[PDB]
Structure formats: C-alpha cells, structure tokens
From a paper:
The third variable (V3) loop on the human immunodeficiency virus 1 (HIV-1) envelope glycoprotein trimer is indispensable for virus cell entry. DARPins are small binding proteins (14–18 kDa) designed based on a consensus derived from naturally occurring ankyrin repeats. Broadly neutralizing DARPins (bnDs) bound V3 solely on open envelope and recognized a four-turn amphipathic α-helix in the carboxy-terminal half of V3 (amino acids 314–324), which we termed ‘αV3C’.
Crystals of bnD.8 and bnD.9 in complex with linear BF520 and BG505 V3 peptides diffracted to a resolution of 1.22 Å and 1.17 Å, respectively, enabling a detailed analysis of the DARPin–V3 interface and definition of contact residues. Strikingly, in both the crystal structures and the cryo-EM structure, V3 formed a distinct, highly similar secondary structure when complexed with the bnDs: a four-turn α-helix extending from residues G314 to I323. In both the complex with bnD.8 and the complex with bnD.9, one face of the α-helix, including the 312GPG314 turn, was buried in the DARPin binding groove. The most buried residues include P313, G314, A316, F317, T320 and I323. Both bnD.8 and bnD.9 binding are facilitated by several hydrogen bonds with most relevant sites shared; for both DARPins, T320V3 interacted with DARPin residues D67 and N/R69 (bnD.8/9), and G314V3 bonded with DARPin residue D104. Bonds between D321V3 and A316V3 with DARPins W46/R80 and S102, respectively, are unique in bnD.8, whereas Y318V3 with K113 and I323V3 with Y13 are unique to bnD.9. Analysis of bnD.9 positioning in complex with V3 peptide by X-ray crystallography, and on the sCD4-triggered trimer by cryo-EM, revealed an intriguing aspect on the binding mode. Overall, the αV3C proved to be an amphipathic helix, with the hydrophobic face oriented toward the likewise hydrophobic DARPin binding groove, thereby allowing multiple hydrophobic interactions to contribute to binding.
Numbering used by the authors:
A (entry chain C): 310 to 329
B (entry chain A): 3 to 162
The structure:
C-alpha cells in the first residue's frame, strides 16, 4: 500500500485524486 | 451539481467552464467528501490560469483536505513553480503541516525541486520543522541524495 514514512499523506491525496 | 461540475472542470483544465460555473452560482469552495476543493485539483494538475481565477473569485488558498494537504503542498510536490508563487502571493501558509507532519518544504525536497525549495525558503519556510518521522526537509534531501537542495537547506539553517 502507501509506504509508511515521509510523503505518505501527500501520496494518499494523490491516490484519491487519481480515482476522481 | 454545480460544485461537482466545478471540481471536474478544475481537474480537466476547463478554464472557460470554471468561469461559466461560477457566474452561474457555483461555490468556489466546493468540497468533496475527501476534503478536496477545485483549488487543490488545479494546483495538483498544473492548471495555473484556473488557480488564478479560483483565487480571484474567493477560493480559500489554505483549504486543507482530510489529510491536511493544502493546494501549496500539491503544487510544491508536483513541480509547479508559478502556481507556488501565486498561492504564496495570495496568502498560502508556507509551513502548513499535513497529517504526516510534512510541510510544502518537505515535499519540495522529497521530489527534488530546487527552485521551489528556494522560493519556499524566501517566504519563510521552516528548516527546523520535523514531520512525524522526525525528518526535516534537509534530512529528506540527504535521504534522496539531492546535494544541491541539501546545500541550500544547510545554508538557510546556518543563516537563520
Ligand atoms: Mg487509483
Ligand atoms: Mg527550476
């Protein structure tokens, strides 16, 4: 999944954006 | 319905439709169940003119999604320098922390954007801010081997 560490919140938002 | 169309217009770079929707009463601060606004989407996808129109018509420059991500976080990570500059000029919080504790400076360092790092620093980005993993932007630049960014972050820290 999203790897745990720096950037994880950014990547989670990016993934959500990718599903719109 | 107008808010969903406005989100989609921002996503797909539909500048003229953004103008039309807001003339017809669309909420410039429309927000989805993830906390994402039109301004977030325009910042992420690099739609500079849409960023400008949204701000002119009242978009909250500092909107946080459900993960604490702001439009500035997204533009900084995605390498959109002019958008970064426009957001800062409009009052964007340079040191906004997302739910991982990352600031725009952390993300600009993570994705290796030298001039974005420099602009953030000139607007007061905090070299001492640590994310929830104990990392400053400098630590991130060391971890990803970006010597130029590490050098400018170390200089900023020394001259603070
Ligand atoms: Mg997806
Ligand atoms: Mg450059």
């Amino acid at each position: 999944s999203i790897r745990i560490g720096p950037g994880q919140a950014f990547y989670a938002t990016g993934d959500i954006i990718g599903d719109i | 319905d107008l808010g969903k169309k406005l989100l989609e217009a921002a996503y797909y770079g539909q500048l003229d439709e953004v103008r039309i929707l807001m003339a017809n009463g669309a909420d410039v601060n429309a927000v989805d169940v993830h906390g994402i606004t039109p301004l977030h989407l325009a910042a992420y996808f690099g739609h500079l003119e849409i960023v400008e129109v949204l701000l002119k018509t009242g978009a909250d420059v500092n909107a946080r999604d459900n993960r604490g991500i702001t439009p500035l976080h997204l533009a900084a990570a995605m390498g959109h320098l002019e958008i970064v500059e426009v957001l800062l000029k409009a009052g964007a919080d340079v040191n906004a922390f997302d739910e991982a504790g990352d600031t725009p400076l952390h993300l600009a360092a993570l994705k290796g954007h030298l001039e974005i790092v420099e602009v953030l620093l000139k607007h007061g980005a905090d070299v001492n801010a640590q994310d929830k993993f104990g990392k400053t932007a400098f630590d991130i630049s060391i971890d990803n081997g970006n010597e130029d960014i590490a050098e400018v972050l170390q200089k900023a820290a020394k001259l603070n």
